[PDB]
Design a protein around this ligand. Structure first.
Ligand SMILES: C[C@H](c1ccccc1)n1c(=O)c(N2CCNCC2)nc2cnc(-c3cnc4cccnn34)cc21
Length: 313
């Protein structure tokens, strides 16, 4: 079971027309995650959605967002070779361990807010932020995943209802980032409490609770955490805080002297490490080939080998 330079191993999950498998890169030995998409079952609008997702992944380069390494395409199948996060979904972690202490939620939430604010810098809204789409790497760092429902902000999608902003329930047109801000308030509440702030026995009950916007504050929750939730979970999207403003909040930065959370500054990608390039020449690729794939940033077998050589094993 090979595809390109990858040996396919255990399945991580499976869904509508796709599965994700862990894999090993043969040339470097690094582990990756590969999404395998059966294109034959997709209609032309699903196909267009797929290629948009790929385009979004190429735009985004952040240490708390799953990175794209390579695209392999046949006429029947699309393979997205991605960063692997070995400790699974935040959702499953909360189920096993219960709520995080605020100091543990804070470390994760700073990473989440940095990643999503950076998406908004790039004019991308995720639109399906939920505990299930936050992965954890071997060091318990957050990696946001699955931009299959994401879009640019300049359709009639509504994500997981418990995380959906009230304007989505009323069927209202919406700009973009404000709905991610609301979902991040729901995420903060789930990290600190282990439960959702709005729930119901059915969609009607859940919808009514979201629109009322009331949620329970546990006795153990600090005043500063409660006040921060108020900046996310604002019914009026016009008055909802922006993430750049929320980054200055007291709770976000408690115990982070000299390290106030700030918008991420994307570094210039080094495509010129000759030690890595020397290794790839020894593997068989020519110097000129490596230069052309890296400069056009082709997400092909070469640029993926270069990136993976830049990561641990
Ligand atoms: C495929 C799916 C998935 C894909 C995208 C976003 C979230 C979840 N998935 C599950 O469904 C799941 N299940 C849920 C049902 N109960 C058993 C555990 N566990 C997972 C654990 N690790 C990953 C993972 C790790 N490195 C990466 C890099 C890219 C993508 N995925 N990925 C994905 C998982």
């Amino acid at each position: 079971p090979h595809i390109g330079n990858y040996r396919l191993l255990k399945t991580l999950g499976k869904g509508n027309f796709a599965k994700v498998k862990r894999a090993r890169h043969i040339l470097t030995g690094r582990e990756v995650a590969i999404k395998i998409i059966d294109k034959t079952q997709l209609n032309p609008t699903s196909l267009q959605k797929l290629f948009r997702e790929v385009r979004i992944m190429k735009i985004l380069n952040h240490p708390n967002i799953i990175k794209l390494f390579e695209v392999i395409e046949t006429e029947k199948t699309l393979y997205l070779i991605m960063e692997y996060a070995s400790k699974g979904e935040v959702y499953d972690y909360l189920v096993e361990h219960g709520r995080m202490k605020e100091k543990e939620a804070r470390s994760k939430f700073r990473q989440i807010v940095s990643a999503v604010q950076y998406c908004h810098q790039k004019r991308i809204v995720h639109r399906d932020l939920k505990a299930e789409n936050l992965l954890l790497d071997a060091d318990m760092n957050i990696k946001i995943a699955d931009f299959g429902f994401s879009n640019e902000f300049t359709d009639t999608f509504c994500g997981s209802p418990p995380y959906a902003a009230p304007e989505l329930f009323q069927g209202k047109k919406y700009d973009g980032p404000e709905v991610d801000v609301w979902s991040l308030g729901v995420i903060l509440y789930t990290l600190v409490s282990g439960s959702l702030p709005f729930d119901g026995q059915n969609l009607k009950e859940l919808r009514e609770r979201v629109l009322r916007g009331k949620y329970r504050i546990p006795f153990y929750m600090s005043t500063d955490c409660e006040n921060l939730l108020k900046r996310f979970l604002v019914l009026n999207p016009i008055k909802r805080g922006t993430l750049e403003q929320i980054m200055k909040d007291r709770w976000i930065n408690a115990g982070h002297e000299e390290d106030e959370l700030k918008p991420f500054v994307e570094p210039e990608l080094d495509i010129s490490d000759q030690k890595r390039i020397d290794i790839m020449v020894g593997m068989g690729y020519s110097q000129e080939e490596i230069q052309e794939s890296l400069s056009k940033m082709k997400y092909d077998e070469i640029t993926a080998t270069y990136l993976l050589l830049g990561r641990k094993s």
